[PDB]
Tab-separated table of C-alpha atoms and ligand atoms in Angstrom:
chain	number	residue	atom	x	y	z
E	12	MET	CA	163.103	61.574	103.043
E	13	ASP	CA	162.022	58.552	101.457
E	14	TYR	CA	159.157	56.817	103.513
E	15	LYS	CA	160.153	53.090	102.823
E	16	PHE	CA	157.953	52.092	105.184
E	17	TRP	CA	155.316	54.883	104.789
E	18	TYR	CA	154.992	54.316	101.434
E	19	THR	CA	153.210	50.896	102.238
E	20	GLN	CA	150.711	52.035	104.207
E	21	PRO	CA	147.489	52.829	103.333
E	22	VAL	CA	148.563	57.297	103.926
E	23	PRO	CA	148.479	59.497	101.557
E	24	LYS	CA	151.697	60.176	99.381
E	25	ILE	CA	153.747	63.137	99.840
E	26	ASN	CA	152.171	65.443	97.108
E	27	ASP	CA	148.694	63.863	97.268
E	28	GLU	CA	145.942	66.708	97.752
E	29	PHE	CA	142.505	65.515	98.231
E	30	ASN	CA	139.118	68.055	97.431
E	31	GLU	CA	136.685	68.406	99.974
E	32	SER	CA	134.493	66.421	98.409
E	33	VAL	CA	136.913	63.524	99.037
E	34	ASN	CA	136.277	62.146	102.572
E	35	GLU	CA	136.406	58.301	103.042
E	36	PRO	CA	138.574	55.664	103.282
E	37	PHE	CA	142.052	54.369	100.879
E	38	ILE	CA	140.863	50.845	102.011
E	39	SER	CA	137.364	49.674	102.467
E	40	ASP	CA	135.667	46.292	102.379
E	41	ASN	CA	137.695	45.411	104.833
E	42	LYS	CA	137.254	42.041	106.700
E	43	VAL	CA	137.783	41.200	109.890
E	44	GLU	CA	137.907	37.179	108.329
E	45	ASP	CA	140.942	38.378	106.650
E	46	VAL	CA	143.372	39.814	109.401
E	47	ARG	CA	146.295	38.198	110.418
E	48	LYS	CA	146.075	36.121	113.206
E	49	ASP	CA	149.768	35.645	114.033
E	50	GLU	CA	151.587	38.855	115.627
E	51	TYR	CA	154.670	40.094	113.817
E	52	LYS	CA	158.183	38.502	113.740
E	53	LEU	CA	160.468	40.724	116.260
E	54	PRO	CA	164.621	40.086	116.099
E	55	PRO	CA	165.564	37.448	118.367
E	56	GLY	CA	165.990	37.841	121.514
E	57	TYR	CA	162.966	40.445	121.523
E	58	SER	CA	159.191	38.889	122.691
E	59	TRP	CA	156.303	41.029	122.891
E	60	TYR	CA	154.108	41.660	126.149
E	61	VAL	CA	150.430	42.681	126.489
E	62	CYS	CA	151.050	45.165	129.965
E	63	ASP	CA	148.183	45.543	132.009
E	64	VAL	CA	147.746	49.845	132.728
E	65	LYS	CA	146.027	48.713	136.302
E	66	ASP	CA	148.736	46.535	137.252
E	67	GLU	CA	151.208	48.893	139.523
E	68	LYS	CA	154.242	47.247	138.663
E	69	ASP	CA	153.643	46.916	134.307
E	70	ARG	CA	152.708	50.861	134.963
E	71	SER	CA	155.598	51.719	136.243
E	72	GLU	CA	157.661	49.664	133.832
E	73	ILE	CA	155.569	51.771	130.955
E	74	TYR	CA	157.104	54.434	132.928
E	75	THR	CA	160.099	54.076	133.053
E	76	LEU	CA	160.488	53.314	129.760
E	77	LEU	CA	159.554	56.844	128.745
E	78	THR	CA	161.228	58.349	131.226
E	79	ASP	CA	164.263	57.234	130.033
E	80	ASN	CA	163.604	57.315	126.495
E	81	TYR	CA	160.478	59.773	125.255
E	82	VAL	CA	160.501	62.529	123.410
E	83	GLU	CA	163.230	64.772	124.169
E	84	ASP	CA	162.600	69.402	122.666
E	85	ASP	CA	164.067	69.840	119.627
E	86	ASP	CA	167.406	71.088	122.048
E	87	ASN	CA	168.158	67.668	124.052
E	88	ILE	CA	167.578	69.528	127.312
E	89	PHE	CA	164.106	68.904	128.040
E	90	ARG	CA	162.471	65.110	128.298
E	91	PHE	CA	158.681	64.805	128.646
E	92	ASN	CA	158.095	63.222	131.950
E	93	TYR	CA	154.432	61.706	131.699
E	94	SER	CA	153.615	60.391	135.172
E	95	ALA	CA	152.298	56.451	136.103
E	96	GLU	CA	148.892	57.980	137.167
E	97	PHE	CA	148.315	60.187	134.348
E	98	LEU	CA	149.006	56.644	131.590
E	99	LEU	CA	147.193	55.441	133.786
E	100	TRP	CA	144.056	57.418	133.026
E	101	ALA	CA	145.448	58.309	129.140
E	102	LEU	CA	144.977	54.701	128.819
E	103	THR	CA	141.753	53.320	130.856
E	104	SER	CA	139.774	55.372	129.109
E	105	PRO	CA	135.807	53.833	128.838
E	106	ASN	CA	136.044	50.595	126.251
E	107	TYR	CA	139.542	50.271	125.819
E	108	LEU	CA	141.391	46.917	124.811
E	109	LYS	CA	144.449	45.667	127.838
E	110	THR	CA	145.567	43.854	124.291
E	111	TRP	CA	145.835	47.570	122.590
E	112	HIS	CA	148.901	48.399	124.758
E	113	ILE	CA	151.812	46.792	123.463
E	114	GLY	CA	155.561	46.102	124.774
E	115	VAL	CA	158.728	44.547	124.171
E	116	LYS	CA	160.566	42.512	125.805
E	117	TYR	CA	164.372	41.964	125.401
E	118	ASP	CA	164.516	38.392	127.053
E	119	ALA	CA	167.953	38.484	128.152
E	120	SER	CA	167.129	41.173	130.994
E	121	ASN	CA	163.323	40.784	131.270
E	122	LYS	CA	163.340	44.418	130.330
E	123	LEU	CA	160.338	46.483	128.608
E	124	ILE	CA	162.940	48.132	125.783
E	125	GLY	CA	159.479	49.369	122.966
E	126	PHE	CA	156.095	50.218	123.344
E	127	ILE	CA	152.766	51.383	121.507
E	128	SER	CA	149.215	52.159	122.494
E	129	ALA	CA	146.189	52.368	121.121
E	130	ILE	CA	142.715	53.447	122.819
E	131	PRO	CA	139.479	53.862	120.943
E	132	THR	CA	137.257	56.481	120.492
E	133	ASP	CA	135.110	57.585	117.580
E	134	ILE	CA	136.318	60.928	115.577
E	135	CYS	CA	133.920	63.311	112.678
E	136	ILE	CA	136.122	63.829	110.322
E	137	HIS	CA	134.694	66.654	107.767
E	138	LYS	CA	131.269	65.881	109.311
E	139	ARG	CA	131.370	61.902	109.002
E	140	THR	CA	132.286	60.046	112.232
E	141	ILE	CA	134.049	56.928	112.872
E	142	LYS	CA	134.976	54.811	115.145
E	143	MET	CA	139.137	54.614	115.403
E	144	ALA	CA	142.242	54.036	117.170
E	145	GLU	CA	143.959	57.335	118.770
E	146	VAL	CA	147.573	55.897	118.849
E	147	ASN	CA	150.101	57.565	121.609
E	148	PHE	CA	152.967	56.786	123.339
E	149	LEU	CA	155.069	55.176	120.131
E	150	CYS	CA	158.665	54.221	122.070
E	151	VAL	CA	161.910	52.252	121.341
E	152	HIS	CA	164.723	52.513	124.005
E	153	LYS	CA	167.058	54.972	123.834
E	154	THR	CA	169.822	51.876	122.491
E	155	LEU	CA	167.710	50.509	120.035
E	156	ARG	CA	167.401	53.531	117.841
E	157	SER	CA	167.337	53.173	113.719
E	158	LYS	CA	166.558	49.126	113.946
E	159	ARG	CA	163.210	49.026	112.594
E	160	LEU	CA	161.448	48.472	115.444
E	161	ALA	CA	158.623	51.089	115.108
E	162	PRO	CA	157.104	49.902	111.832
E	163	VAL	CA	157.328	46.375	113.897
E	164	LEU	CA	155.508	48.101	116.457
E	165	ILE	CA	152.849	49.650	114.224
E	166	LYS	CA	151.896	47.248	112.095
E	167	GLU	CA	151.388	44.601	115.447
E	168	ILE	CA	148.987	47.255	116.744
E	169	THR	CA	147.523	48.412	113.402
E	170	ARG	CA	147.329	43.744	113.577
E	171	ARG	CA	144.849	43.954	116.891
E	172	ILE	CA	143.131	46.941	116.702
E	173	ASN	CA	142.277	45.294	112.640
E	174	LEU	CA	140.723	42.171	114.635
E	175	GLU	CA	138.412	44.838	116.550
E	176	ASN	CA	136.693	45.549	112.754
E	177	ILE	CA	138.169	49.465	112.936
E	178	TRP	CA	140.289	50.237	109.949
E	179	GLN	CA	140.761	53.884	111.100
E	180	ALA	CA	143.843	55.932	113.290
E	181	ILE	CA	144.060	59.380	114.478
E	182	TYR	CA	147.771	59.912	116.019
E	183	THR	CA	150.606	63.072	116.179
E	184	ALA	CA	153.601	63.485	115.994
E	185	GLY	CA	156.410	66.560	115.531
E	186	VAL	CA	158.124	64.525	113.043
E	187	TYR	CA	156.626	65.166	109.439
E	188	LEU	CA	155.462	62.035	108.445
E	189	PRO	CA	152.634	61.405	104.744
E	190	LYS	CA	150.696	63.573	104.965
E	191	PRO	CA	149.474	66.027	107.798
E	192	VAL	CA	145.660	66.942	107.589
E	193	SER	CA	146.376	69.198	109.945
E	194	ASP	CA	149.712	71.493	111.401
E	195	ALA	CA	149.412	73.759	114.688
E	196	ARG	CA	151.990	75.153	115.938
E	197	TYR	CA	152.817	75.297	119.868
E	198	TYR	CA	152.875	78.237	121.864
E	199	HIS	CA	154.068	78.860	125.531
E	200	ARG	CA	152.664	81.367	128.620
E	201	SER	CA	155.491	81.682	131.381
E	202	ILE	CA	153.892	81.534	134.864
E	203	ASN	CA	157.291	80.767	136.705
E	204	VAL	CA	159.698	83.208	134.470
E	205	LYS	CA	163.011	83.376	136.636
E	206	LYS	CA	162.529	79.544	136.451
E	207	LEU	CA	161.614	79.097	132.741
E	208	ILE	CA	164.936	81.677	132.137
E	209	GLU	CA	167.371	79.748	134.904
E	210	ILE	CA	167.102	76.198	132.949
E	211	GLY	CA	166.623	78.019	129.018
E	212	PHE	CA	162.839	77.656	128.580
E	213	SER	CA	163.204	81.456	127.666
E	214	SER	CA	165.337	83.660	127.240
E	215	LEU	CA	166.083	87.847	128.548
E	216	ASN	CA	167.522	90.621	126.243
E	217	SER	CA	168.936	94.404	127.199
E	218	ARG	CA	165.563	95.869	126.950
E	219	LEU	CA	164.213	93.140	129.194
E	220	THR	CA	165.821	93.241	132.054
E	221	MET	CA	165.023	90.269	134.743
E	222	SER	CA	162.109	92.922	136.913
E	223	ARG	CA	160.464	93.434	133.664
E	224	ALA	CA	160.011	90.152	132.472
E	225	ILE	CA	158.501	89.682	135.854
E	226	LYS	CA	156.423	92.309	135.798
E	227	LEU	CA	155.665	91.250	131.652
E	228	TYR	CA	154.503	87.829	132.924
E	229	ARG	CA	152.923	88.883	136.440
E	230	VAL	CA	148.916	88.054	136.937
E	231	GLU	CA	146.151	89.456	138.860
E	232	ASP	CA	145.037	86.727	141.596
E	233	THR	CA	141.503	86.862	141.057
E	234	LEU	CA	138.705	85.200	138.524
E	235	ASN	CA	136.876	87.458	134.991
E	236	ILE	CA	134.685	84.296	136.086
E	237	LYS	CA	134.422	84.257	139.202
E	238	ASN	CA	132.606	80.740	140.419
E	239	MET	CA	135.007	78.900	137.682
E	240	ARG	CA	135.309	75.890	140.464
E	241	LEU	CA	136.580	72.417	140.192
E	242	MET	CA	134.100	69.993	138.278
E	243	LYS	CA	132.504	67.261	140.274
E	244	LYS	CA	130.680	64.403	139.272
E	245	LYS	CA	127.539	66.303	139.263
E	246	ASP	CA	128.302	68.546	135.957
E	247	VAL	CA	129.131	65.792	133.761
E	248	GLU	CA	125.636	66.102	131.762
E	249	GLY	CA	126.622	69.983	131.675
E	250	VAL	CA	130.119	70.178	130.423
E	251	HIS	CA	129.226	66.782	127.919
E	252	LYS	CA	126.239	69.533	126.058
E	253	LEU	CA	128.506	72.603	126.579
E	254	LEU	CA	131.634	70.979	125.220
E	255	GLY	CA	129.639	68.935	122.848
E	256	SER	CA	127.721	71.384	121.069
E	257	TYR	CA	131.141	73.532	120.645
E	258	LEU	CA	132.846	70.701	119.076
E	259	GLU	CA	130.322	69.877	116.300
E	260	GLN	CA	131.848	73.374	114.325
E	261	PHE	CA	135.295	71.668	113.988
E	262	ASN	CA	136.605	69.875	111.041
E	263	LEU	CA	138.548	66.974	113.226
E	264	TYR	CA	136.680	66.348	116.785
E	265	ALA	CA	136.036	63.327	119.186
E	266	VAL	CA	132.507	62.554	119.606
E	267	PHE	CA	132.081	62.044	123.740
E	268	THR	CA	129.587	60.096	125.114
E	269	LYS	CA	128.907	61.071	129.078
E	270	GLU	CA	131.193	58.187	129.725
E	271	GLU	CA	134.036	59.902	127.758
E	272	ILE	CA	133.681	62.758	129.383
E	273	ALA	CA	133.552	61.897	133.263
E	274	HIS	CA	136.911	60.347	132.114
E	275	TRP	CA	138.436	62.697	130.270
E	276	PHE	CA	137.480	65.606	132.567
E	277	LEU	CA	136.831	65.078	135.798
E	278	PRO	CA	139.751	66.123	138.074
E	279	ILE	CA	142.676	63.846	139.294
E	280	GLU	CA	145.403	65.833	140.610
E	281	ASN	CA	148.142	65.759	138.664
E	282	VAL	CA	146.943	64.502	135.946
E	283	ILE	CA	143.968	66.884	134.560
E	284	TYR	CA	142.290	69.886	136.318
E	285	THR	CA	138.535	71.039	135.107
E	286	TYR	CA	136.828	73.900	136.356
E	287	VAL	CA	133.142	75.275	135.230
E	288	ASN	CA	131.127	77.669	135.562
E	289	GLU	CA	127.486	76.976	137.037
E	290	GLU	CA	124.546	79.223	136.625
E	291	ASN	CA	121.128	78.192	137.323
E	292	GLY	CA	121.436	74.285	136.859
E	293	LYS	CA	122.975	74.710	133.945
E	294	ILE	CA	127.394	74.869	132.722
E	295	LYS	CA	127.847	77.665	130.946
E	296	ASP	CA	132.144	78.060	130.711
E	297	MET	CA	134.389	75.156	131.033
E	298	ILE	CA	138.164	75.380	131.694
E	299	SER	CA	140.590	71.982	131.253
E	300	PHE	CA	144.344	71.038	131.390
E	301	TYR	CA	146.620	68.000	131.831
E	302	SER	CA	149.688	68.284	133.290
E	303	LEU	CA	152.772	67.553	132.001
E	304	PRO	CA	156.326	67.229	133.300
E	305	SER	CA	159.251	67.926	131.462
E	306	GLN	CA	162.549	65.856	133.333
E	307	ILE	CA	165.111	68.832	133.119
E	308	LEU	CA	168.188	67.581	131.405
E	309	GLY	CA	171.326	67.773	134.297
E	310	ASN	CA	170.999	71.151	136.658
E	311	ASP	CA	171.662	71.167	139.525
E	312	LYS	CA	168.563	73.005	140.477
E	313	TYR	CA	166.071	72.182	139.050
E	314	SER	CA	165.053	68.452	137.916
E	315	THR	CA	161.235	69.314	136.493
E	316	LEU	CA	159.664	71.389	134.653
E	317	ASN	CA	155.489	71.840	135.764
E	318	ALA	CA	153.955	72.269	132.626
E	319	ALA	CA	150.104	72.943	131.628
E	320	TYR	CA	149.139	72.321	128.459
E	321	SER	CA	145.617	73.422	127.688
E	322	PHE	CA	142.694	70.483	126.993
E	323	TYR	CA	139.141	71.855	126.117
E	324	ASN	CA	137.584	75.274	126.828
E	325	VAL	CA	134.063	77.071	125.996
E	326	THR	CA	132.779	80.121	126.955
E	327	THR	CA	129.394	81.656	127.077
E	328	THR	CA	129.242	83.887	129.248
E	329	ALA	CA	132.855	86.168	128.870
E	330	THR	CA	135.190	86.284	126.060
E	331	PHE	CA	137.668	83.802	125.004
E	332	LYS	CA	140.581	86.116	125.886
E	333	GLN	CA	138.903	86.520	129.561
E	334	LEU	CA	138.612	82.588	129.888
E	335	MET	CA	141.558	81.799	129.072
E	336	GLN	CA	143.002	84.316	131.116
E	337	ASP	CA	141.331	82.549	134.028
E	338	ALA	CA	142.709	79.349	132.618
E	339	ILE	CA	145.850	80.879	133.252
E	340	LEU	CA	145.667	81.932	136.218
E	341	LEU	CA	144.034	78.436	137.426
E	342	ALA	CA	147.466	76.970	136.218
E	343	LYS	CA	149.221	79.142	138.626
E	344	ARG	CA	147.341	78.364	141.299
E	345	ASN	CA	148.011	74.453	140.767
E	346	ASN	CA	151.382	75.424	141.038
E	347	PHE	CA	152.573	75.131	137.086
E	348	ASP	CA	155.777	77.072	135.448
E	349	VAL	CA	154.354	77.731	132.161
E	350	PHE	CA	151.166	77.295	130.281
E	351	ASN	CA	150.997	75.675	126.591
E	352	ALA	CA	148.335	75.513	124.552
E	353	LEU	CA	148.339	75.123	120.401
E	354	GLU	CA	147.126	76.987	117.909
E	355	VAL	CA	143.801	75.081	117.586
E	356	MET	CA	140.047	76.183	118.353
E	357	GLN	CA	140.777	79.580	118.980
E	358	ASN	CA	143.202	79.677	120.670
E	359	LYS	CA	146.075	81.388	118.378
E	360	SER	CA	143.607	84.539	118.630
E	361	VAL	CA	144.176	85.062	121.691
E	362	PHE	CA	148.120	84.374	122.233
E	363	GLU	CA	148.891	87.895	121.237
E	364	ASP	CA	146.752	89.891	123.775
E	365	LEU	CA	147.441	86.944	126.869
E	366	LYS	CA	151.683	86.855	126.066
E	367	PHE	CA	151.748	83.482	125.036
E	368	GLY	CA	155.249	82.935	122.823
E	369	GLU	CA	155.206	80.875	119.949
E	370	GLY	CA	157.418	78.015	120.256
E	371	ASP	CA	159.967	75.894	118.141
E	372	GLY	CA	158.362	72.617	117.252
E	373	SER	CA	154.432	72.164	115.299
E	374	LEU	CA	152.348	69.254	116.670
E	375	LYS	CA	151.000	67.685	113.093
E	376	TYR	CA	147.660	65.463	113.670
E	377	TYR	CA	147.642	62.492	111.028
E	378	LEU	CA	144.849	59.916	109.990
E	379	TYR	CA	145.287	56.537	109.045
E	380	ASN	CA	143.450	54.730	106.147
E	381	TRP	CA	141.935	57.950	105.320
E	382	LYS	CA	141.212	60.250	102.462
E	383	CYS	CA	139.865	64.483	102.812
E	384	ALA	CA	141.306	66.924	102.320
E	385	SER	CA	143.990	69.264	104.782
E	386	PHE	CA	142.390	72.662	106.717
E	387	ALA	CA	144.082	75.024	108.561
E	388	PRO	CA	144.721	74.660	112.539
E	389	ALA	CA	142.221	76.609	113.862
E	390	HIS	CA	139.654	73.916	112.059
E	391	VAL	CA	141.296	71.430	114.404
E	392	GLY	CA	138.718	70.638	117.648
E	393	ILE	CA	141.097	67.794	119.272
E	394	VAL	CA	143.598	67.869	121.654
E	395	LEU	CA	145.696	64.527	122.362
E	396	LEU	CA	147.789	63.615	125.009
D	411	LIG	C1	143.830	50.747	111.803
D	411	LIG	C2	144.519	51.143	112.628
D	411	LIG	C3	145.922	51.830	112.769
D	411	LIG	C4	147.076	51.991	113.785
D	411	LIG	C5	148.323	52.732	113.377
D	411	LIG	C6	148.852	54.122	113.031
D	411	LIG	C7	149.902	54.252	112.669
D	411	LIG	C8	150.862	54.736	113.791
D	411	LIG	C9	151.550	55.100	114.000
D	411	LIG	C10	152.755	56.132	115.064
D	411	LIG	C11	152.461	57.534	115.566
D	411	LIG	C12	152.653	57.142	117.241
D	411	LIG	C13	152.239	58.120	117.548
D	411	LIG	C14	153.114	58.950	119.021
D	411	LIG	O1	152.935	57.671	119.850
D	411	LIG	C15	153.199	60.565	119.581
D	411	LIG	S1	154.744	61.158	118.924
D	411	LIG	C16	156.538	60.557	119.476
D	411	LIG	C17	156.555	59.086	119.101
D	411	LIG	N1	157.747	59.128	120.468
D	411	LIG	C18	158.933	59.689	120.233
D	411	LIG	O2	159.153	60.626	119.917
D	411	LIG	C19	160.345	58.842	121.529
D	411	LIG	C20	160.953	59.150	121.141
D	411	LIG	N2	161.328	58.126	119.722
D	411	LIG	C21	161.363	57.034	119.809
D	411	LIG	O3	161.079	56.260	120.394
D	411	LIG	C22	161.930	56.316	118.708
D	411	LIG	O4	162.779	57.817	117.698
D	411	LIG	C23	160.496	55.689	117.725
D	411	LIG	C24	159.938	54.476	118.233
D	411	LIG	C25	159.859	57.354	117.624
D	411	LIG	C26	160.719	55.559	116.511
D	411	LIG	O5	161.845	54.988	116.380
D	411	LIG	P1	163.544	54.676	115.115
D	411	LIG	O6	164.051	53.712	116.093
D	411	LIG	O7	163.603	56.224	115.274
D	411	LIG	O8	162.895	54.514	113.775
D	411	LIG	P2	162.886	53.006	113.570
D	411	LIG	O9	162.736	51.967	113.879
D	411	LIG	O10	164.267	52.557	112.994
D	411	LIG	O11	161.535	53.347	112.547
D	411	LIG	C27	161.805	54.469	111.048
D	411	LIG	C28	160.600	54.274	110.348
D	411	LIG	O12	160.018	54.598	111.830
D	411	LIG	C29	158.878	56.342	111.221
D	411	LIG	N3	159.127	56.663	111.813
D	411	LIG	C30	159.932	57.739	112.759
D	411	LIG	N4	159.100	58.283	113.844
D	411	LIG	C31	157.884	58.365	113.775
D	411	LIG	C32	156.353	58.699	114.667
D	411	LIG	N5	156.830	59.315	115.998
D	411	LIG	N6	155.585	58.052	114.625
D	411	LIG	C33	155.228	57.620	113.145
D	411	LIG	N7	156.127	56.633	112.729
D	411	LIG	C34	157.386	57.032	113.019
D	411	LIG	C35	160.729	56.514	110.280
D	411	LIG	O13	159.859	57.520	109.455
D	411	LIG	C36	160.597	55.147	109.494
D	411	LIG	O14	159.390	54.969	108.977
D	411	LIG	P3	159.750	56.111	106.876
D	411	LIG	O15	161.008	54.762	106.993
D	411	LIG	O16	158.737	55.194	106.353
D	411	LIG	O17	159.879	57.190	107.218
D	412	LIG	CL1	154.954	42.814	106.904
D	413	LIG	MG1	164.641	50.759	116.159
């Protein structure tokens, strides 16, 4: 469209296109001393609020905000419903800054009507590793849309990130903004076929009857990798080597420390599931997926769609297809109705044989203040929450 806000930012214009040989900031030589020390101005009657995600009640307010006002599907049927424990995990990774968890209250009601967050992560883009912020959970109450609050939230979190001498960010969105480094479609694998049908997530046809669909998606309750088990603390060193080594082949990925691997992969029920295969004290395969339910809007039978989202999967003792089949089984065993994945890393290679269906959106990946060539999503090696 016009991108009146985005055009003022150090991000590519719609028709910018860079060679593989360009891989650098739009704006370099930035100085912490020059960063604005004043908070951005909000409309009258609204105030900044620093959220303490560790405090159950502040976390609860964020939770209510996103539950009522966060991302809905292309047809307004489902609304994503990140749990409060999920937020706690997502926002308190190693070395996180409380002051990057930013709310906006309406002064008269004392209610949170806006939120944006970031966490620090080292990102390797085209072989250069840069300290970045990973921005997520941008949300404006539905009653306050199209009033230019989001640019205020964006400019304010940028200011706070810059105060820590960080000048790049990574973020994703389902909407097209200037200008994606990569673009990955959603694919879905039906587990609880009948419920997906009944809530309008999937459909049948005259050559696919209900029973024939249920048979189509039926899975054998037996693992290809028989020793796949929930990750424990003892496996942190092993997962660090297995996943770290794997990721280096990609054009975009997080560079995890051991403390980050423990955070991101140690299991938390109804948040993060990590399974590992250990063989001679070495971790040789891993599977992981996170829990992101959607509230089902106005349905008398079901309130919640239980979805698993593929996170990081690595095999050295089986095929990729066999490892993903085990992923679908582990998600079934943990009561999920559907397993979702993006066409990143090696994932697209197994979607046809494992009976994934193409979804409606795509997820665009973005860098702030970074000029580089775009690339196919098989070359993406990071999955944001
Ligand atoms: C060095 C550090 C740098 C740190 C920061 C890096 C950048 C981080 C950027 C953030 C990444 C977050 C990633 C993320 O959390 C995950 S992607 C999901 C974002 N959240 C949702 O979609 C939830 C439901 N929607 C809303 O709450 C509102 O519709 C939001 C708040 C989305 C926009 O509220 P609104 O009431 O509809 O809109 P106005 O206030 O009037 O604002 C219009 C301006 O906002 C631009 N816009 C719209 N959606 C966007 C989006 N998803 N990213 C970036 N920009 C987006 C839009 O293009 C326009 O600018 P333009 O006029 O130039 O087009
Ligand atoms: Cl400004
Ligand atoms: Mg607004």
